[PDB]
Design a protein around this ligand. Sequence first.
Ligand code: 6WG
Ligand code: 6WG
Ligand code: 6WG
Ligand code: 6WG
Lengths: 255, 255, 255, 255
Amino acid sequence: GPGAYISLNYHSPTIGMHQNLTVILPEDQSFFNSDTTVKPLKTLMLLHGLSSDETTYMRYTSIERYANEHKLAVIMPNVDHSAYANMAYGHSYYDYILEVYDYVHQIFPLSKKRDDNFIAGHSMGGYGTIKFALTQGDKFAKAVPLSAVFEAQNLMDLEWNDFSKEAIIGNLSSVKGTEHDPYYLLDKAVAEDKQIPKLLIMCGKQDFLYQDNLDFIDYLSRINVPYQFEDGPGDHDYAYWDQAIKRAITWMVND
Amino acid sequence: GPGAYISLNYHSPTIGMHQNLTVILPEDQSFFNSDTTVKPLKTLMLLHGLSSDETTYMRYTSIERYANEHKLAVIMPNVDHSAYANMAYGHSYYDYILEVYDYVHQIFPLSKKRDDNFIAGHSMGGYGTIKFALTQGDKFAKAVPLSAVFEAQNLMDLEWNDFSKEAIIGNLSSVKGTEHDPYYLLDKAVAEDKQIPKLLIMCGKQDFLYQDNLDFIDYLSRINVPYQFEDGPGDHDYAYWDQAIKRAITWMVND
Amino acid sequence: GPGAYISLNYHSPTIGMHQNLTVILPEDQSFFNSDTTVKPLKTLMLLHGLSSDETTYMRYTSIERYANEHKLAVIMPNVDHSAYANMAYGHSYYDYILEVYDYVHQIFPLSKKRDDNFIAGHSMGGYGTIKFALTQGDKFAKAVPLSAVFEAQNLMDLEWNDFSKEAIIGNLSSVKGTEHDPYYLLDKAVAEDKQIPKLLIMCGKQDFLYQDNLDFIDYLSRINVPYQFEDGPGDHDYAYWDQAIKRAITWMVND
Amino acid sequence: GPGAYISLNYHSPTIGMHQNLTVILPEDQSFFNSDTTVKPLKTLMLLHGLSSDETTYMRYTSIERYANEHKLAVIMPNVDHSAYANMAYGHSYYDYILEVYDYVHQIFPLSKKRDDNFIAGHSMGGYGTIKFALTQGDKFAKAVPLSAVFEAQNLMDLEWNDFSKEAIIGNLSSVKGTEHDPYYLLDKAVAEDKQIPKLLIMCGKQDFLYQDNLDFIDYLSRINVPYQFEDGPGDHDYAYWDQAIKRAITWMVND
Ligand SMILES: *C(=O)N1CCCC[C@@H]1c1ccccc1
Ligand SMILES: *C(=O)N1CCCC[C@@H]1c1ccccc1
Ligand SMILES: *C(=O)N1CCCC[C@@H]1c1ccccc1
Ligand SMILES: *C(=O)N1CCCC[C@@H]1c1ccccc1
């Protein structure tokens, strides 16, 4: 089963600039028959890590092959070094992901039902995934952080090439207890009885963030929030993310 | 002002291969608001000439700027050296254009009303435009051949690099009186009382097809088919088609 | 080390039209220092199968990841339904591959040494690979047919979607003894003592072309031409070609 | 004149992320002769304005047609909302432009002589053009600011969609006397007997930056810096920049 690979570049009203976006749209027989109603596809929002962009999942994995097999549309935006935040000094990249979600669901044949919408991503994108899962729980039925950063201070303190902590968080001395802290977002969601998407958290056992993942699922267990955790051999690279996204895609479309 | 520039590559069931396609999709406020119904856009099917492809209108004109002013969606397929024919030895490129039409109208917010759908193209694409206008009149309200080939044997006998006459028409010596002949298609459309689209025919006065164009509008006049004809200085190049397509787009979107 | 992914569209003098080409160019520190001459890279010409195009290796495999690991440049042209032949009724796609080879070696930092240049491909592209291996042996030190068609009459008689046998071979009754026959090309290469590139032949055991590959390597054995043959589980799909190409790239650069 | 349109995406060591870049590469015979030495092309570094990106010159002008006509290679990078600065809280985008210059001169057949290299851009890109002209005068023989901002404080105090002045300049209350201020860069270039490329300054008379351009040219004569200023009807839009780059390209190439 094949599909369409789509590169879109549009002027975003939220971030004030042209920006590239890539979309995988699997083929359906209704797309070629003008007398049939388009039946909308299940949709995955997929978020890249630091130093990656909207092209890197396509280049370094076989994701389109996996998505085609499962009739899953995949949306891959670009957010730079933003950590998926409305940046103190930068762009409103949190709001941007929400605009991308609304835009593709308006212009493409994508289901708008919560049960048909998922979010996933790796490293900074796993951090982004858990932030959206805990603040936009009504938009996604399932969320898949891969090799995620859950202790936000480890992301902000990283000395990554050309990376600016202050652009994201400004003057802030710590992120604990703020909108940047997944532990705070999680306590907030439980306290307000928000829907939390079904969680499949994956991380390779040789990954440097492996302890970070253990600490977070340990906290989830202690506050009685369900999840699936899958580890096994793997490091912090696209060889691991290629295999994990294949497993994640199978899990999201099947129950 | 702003819009989306879209590159699509999908596996076409009609031509049995992956093929690239370009789409210009102007922005509409309904595209960014999940609570409003999408307002479908007026749509232009735009056909390239021989040796061009799906990228060349973008590269050699400012078509996206003009389309954006008038909120006109533009579909630009690729058909190789086919002359928009179901080839004797090749691909079913006539059927391909009908497939592209149904496909983009299924997956994008494009109006399906006849009054909102137009077709245009230059040289071999003007030849294609008049063929679809005279055989698919129920799909297009307006048609704009630019520097078109109306006497088909000029194209079939043209001595262009790597161009194969026989791939298109096979062993046929002449194209007159066949599906490849716009005069025949025209006589059959009038004889069968088919709806024929509103016609704007343009061609520069220094173009080698100028006299070819004069012959065709003279025949249109003798069989009581209306048209508007625009000439003036210009040759067979993108300096002319950049100008001509800007004027054509204003004519299409305005009653 | 991540490198560059490059999409090129240029007007080909050989096939008389614009055509898309994709290139993977791994990073070399000399690319960032204007005062040095570029260290020319090893280069692989990679040929797609029928119904694929210049984007399908990127989309359905992780080839860029594998190429980056081995600092291997990769050239991926598009040749439609041509079977890499100068078509009886169509385009001169055999000559086209030679033009692509000359073009990318002129404009990119690619080694022009025979020992640094390789060719590979699957199905129709493995058939193309073996023809180029046996007719351009001075240009390639290694050749890797994957799931190749070696008995050409099976591809010509294949009834694939919109596939035209006469477009390639015209009025020929059979392909035995012609330029289209790899067995003839092999006998001719041995008879004239042409250099034959180092051969790695791969085919999945569940592939319908498996017996066709066994027949060909048996003939190679009987005329004392060396080769390495790799089978194992796998069918005729990109799941198989994703890791045949990963093994092939390791084999090509490590001699 | 036909040519190559090239999209490149590479992981930049300077800005720590994958980034897209577009390149226009006109044809020369030597690109198709394996036996001739490639003749290096004249090269234009072309800088977009605020809210544009690496695709917008190709989409909203006919620049490739003009460049092909004069055998001019054109490099179009993306620098987001950076104003071509090494940002206080962001990316090292000044250094990035220098990396791009070195990179494309290593991997493409581009002349490294000063007399063959030019720089141009509009609005924020005209501001960028004058900054590189006055700090990298040895890399460029000619520079063309189009509708530029010379009084840098107009750009920093601008109230544009999602635009962050503090990302660029930090706490600075004024830009005067700093690297962001073109008037200081000009006095320092004159003071240090630094080479100033030949200057063609263009601005439409209805452009809101027109008085800002008049002020700069009045200062240029006042201190003996030669220039040509070209005005005429035009506003701050791509309709004007389409003229102006067409005229600008003819001026730089012909000598
Ligand atoms: C993930 O996107 N991050 C970017 C570089 C590699 C992993 C890294 C990270 C490491 C440690 C803490 C947070 C982020
Ligand atoms: C138009 O598509 N054609 C391609 C090459 C230039 C003009 C040419 C044509 C010339 C004369 C008759 C038919 C086509
Ligand atoms: C390979 O490119 N061919 C295209 C379709 C799938 C395999 C097919 C082929 C099958 C049998 C004989 C020849 C070709
Ligand atoms: C140019 O790129 N700038 C972005 C918005 C429109 C013009 C604008 C600018 C205006 C005035 C001063 C500096 C920049």
